[PDB]
From a paper:
Kinetoplastids (such as Trypanosoma brucei), a group of evolutionarily divergent eukaryotes, have a unique set of kinetochore proteins that lack any significant homology to canonical kinetochore components. KKT4 has the following predicted regions conserved among kinetoplastid species: an N-terminal α helix, a coiled-coil region and a block of basic residues in the microtubule-binding domain, and a BRCT domain at the C terminus.
To test structural conservation in other kinetoplastid species, we attempted to solve the crystal structure of the KKT4 coiled-coil fragment from L. mexicana. Like TcKKT4117–218, LmKKT4184–284 has helices arranged in a parallel coiled-coil fold. LmKKT4184–284 has six regular heptad repeats from the N terminus to Q224, and after that point the helices move apart and lose their supercoiling as observed for TcKKT4117–218. The two chains in LmKKT4184–284 differ in length, with helices spanning T184 to the C terminus in one chain and T184 to R257 in the other. The region beyond I245, where the helices have moved away from each other, had high B factors in both chains, suggesting enhanced flexibility. Interestingly, the end of the longer helix, which contains extra residues from the expression vector, makes seemingly stabilizing contacts with other molecules in the crystal lattice, which potentially explains why our attempts to obtain diffraction-quality crystals for the proper construct ending at Q284 failed. Superposition of the coiled coils from T. cruzi and L. mexicana revealed a good structural match with a root-mean-square deviation (RMSD) of 1.03 Å (for 123 Cα), confirming the conservation of the coiled-coil structure in these species.
Residue numbers in the entry:
A (entry chain B): 182 to 258
B (entry chain A): 182 to 291
Write the structure that this text describes.
Amino acid sequence: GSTANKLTEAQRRIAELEKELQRTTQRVDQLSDVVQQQKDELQAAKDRHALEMEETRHAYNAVIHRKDEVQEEALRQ
Amino acid sequence: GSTANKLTEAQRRIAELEKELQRTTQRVDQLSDVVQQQKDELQAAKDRHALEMEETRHAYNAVIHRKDEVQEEALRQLLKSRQLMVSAARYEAVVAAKKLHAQEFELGAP
């Protein structure tokens, strides 16, 4: 085949490869976005659990303190 | 000439693109693997958090309940002890007031 014909075919293949590289690169960035969203969600869940655990511990400690005080006042009286 | 040179240039550009596509398609796969692992991780974490929260609440609650039980029984025993001291003092006061009044009355007999 002629050199010119080969060039036309090479130019077609370039255009085809560019399209496919664009498509695949677009998917990389979409997946990178999912990865970060998942990381944010995992931290958010950990933060929510820690907050619930801490609210519950403060409540327990307050109740123990309160019941000690009441008992103390009962025994002083 | 020019035609041949442009073909050589195009062949190089094809080789560059093919290698970039290979790398990009590998990155997609690496990211796809991360996405699935993070899904599994998220669920595992939610399950651990829920179990930990439930066990923690039950432990606090069992300790609070035992504290109420032990404290209330401490008062109940103290209050029973007081009721006994008082029922005995009250009986000892009738007994002594009766004895005193009988002695005073009797001393006055002929």
